[PDB]
Every structure is written in C-alpha cells, then in structure tokens.
Amino acid sequence: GSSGSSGMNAAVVRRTQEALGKVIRRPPLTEKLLSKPPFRYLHDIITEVIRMTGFMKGLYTDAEMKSDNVKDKDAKISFLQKAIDVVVMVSGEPLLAKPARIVAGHEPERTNELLQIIGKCCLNKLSSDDAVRRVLAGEK
C-alpha cells in the first residue's frame, strides 16, 4: 500500500474526525482513510455535504455529482478545484491543498486541512451562495 510519508500525524487526523463528525454519515471517518483518502472517498463527502448540510449547494452540475463521469484525472482535479475555491472564499482561511497533489496521493495533511475547513463551514451552517456564484461565473 501507499505510504503516508512526510507529516500527517495523529493530531491532524483526530481534528478532522471532530470537524467532519457533525456534517455527514455516508463514508466512515477512519484514521486509515483520512491518512490518505482516495478520490471516490472525497467525492462522497463533497457531494453528500450538499445533500445533508446544504454547503456548496448548486456548485456542481447534475453530471459532476456522479463519480463515473468524474473518471478522468483532469475532471477529478477540476471537481476538487471548485470545492477548494468555495471553501477558501466562504471560510476566509488559506489552503495549500492543491487538487493535483490530492488526486496524485500527496500532501494528505493538507487534504485533512481542506476537510477541517469544510467542517468549519458546515458547523457555522454557511449557505455559500455568493462564493458558489463566483466559481460558476469562472466556468469557460
């Protein structure tokens, strides 16, 4: 299996378990899965948050919320890039989590940081409408 090399300690992971612990109920918030999540696991969170909390609602089209359409690495990067954009805009927090590193299986402590700020936005019950509209206006 792929190694969680550089950073990614238990105190980062246990903070993500508290941050996502109030948001959704589909994927299990395991130490293993949060130490290096697959794209499908992140897509499960990023679509289920819209269903359960309403954070990032309307940010994806009807085809973008389906992981069999989001099969290509370029589409996976584009899908994560939309979430990263709204999460930074709504929370006011910086993120060093690059969509390319997330899909390649690198920098997983920044993937945890992204999920912790998604947690922050959900705990504050934020509607995200203006930030979602800025990412939609950014479409080609």
UniProtKB/Swiss-Prot annotation:
It is found in: Cytoplasm, Cytoskeleton; Cell projection, Cilium; Cytoplasm, Cytoskeleton, Cilium axoneme; Cytoplasm, Cytoskeleton, Cilium basal body. Ubiquitous. Changing residue 132 to M: In SLSN9; results in altered folding of the N-terminus; does not localize to the ciliary tip and transition zone; does not affect interaction with IFT20; loss of interaction with MAP4. Component of the IFT complex B, at least composed of IFT20, IFT22, IFT25, IFT27, IFT46, IFT52, TRAF3IP1/IFT54, IFT57, IFT74, IFT80, IFT81, and IFT88. Interacts with IFT88. Interacts with IL13RA1. Binds to microtubules, TRAF3 and DISC1. Interacts with MAP4. It is linked to Senior-Loken syndrome 9: A renal-retinal disorder characterized by progressive wasting of the filtering unit of the kidney (nephronophthisis), with or without medullary cystic renal disease, and progressive eye disease. Typically this disorder becomes apparent during the first year of life. Plays an inhibitory role on IL13 signaling by binding to IL13RA1. Involved in suppression of IL13-induced STAT6 phosphorylation, transcriptional activity and DNA-binding. Recruits TRAF3 and DISC1 to the microtubules. Involved in kidney development and epithelial morphogenesis. Involved in the regulation of microtubule cytoskeleton organization. Is a negative regulator of microtubule stability, acting through the control of MAP4 levels. Involved in ciliogenesis. Belongs to the TRAF3IP1 family. This is TRAF3-interacting protein 1. It comes from Homo sapiens. The lineage of its organism: Eukaryota, Metazoa, Chordata, Craniata, Vertebrata. The chain holds residues 1 to 133 of 691 of the full protein.
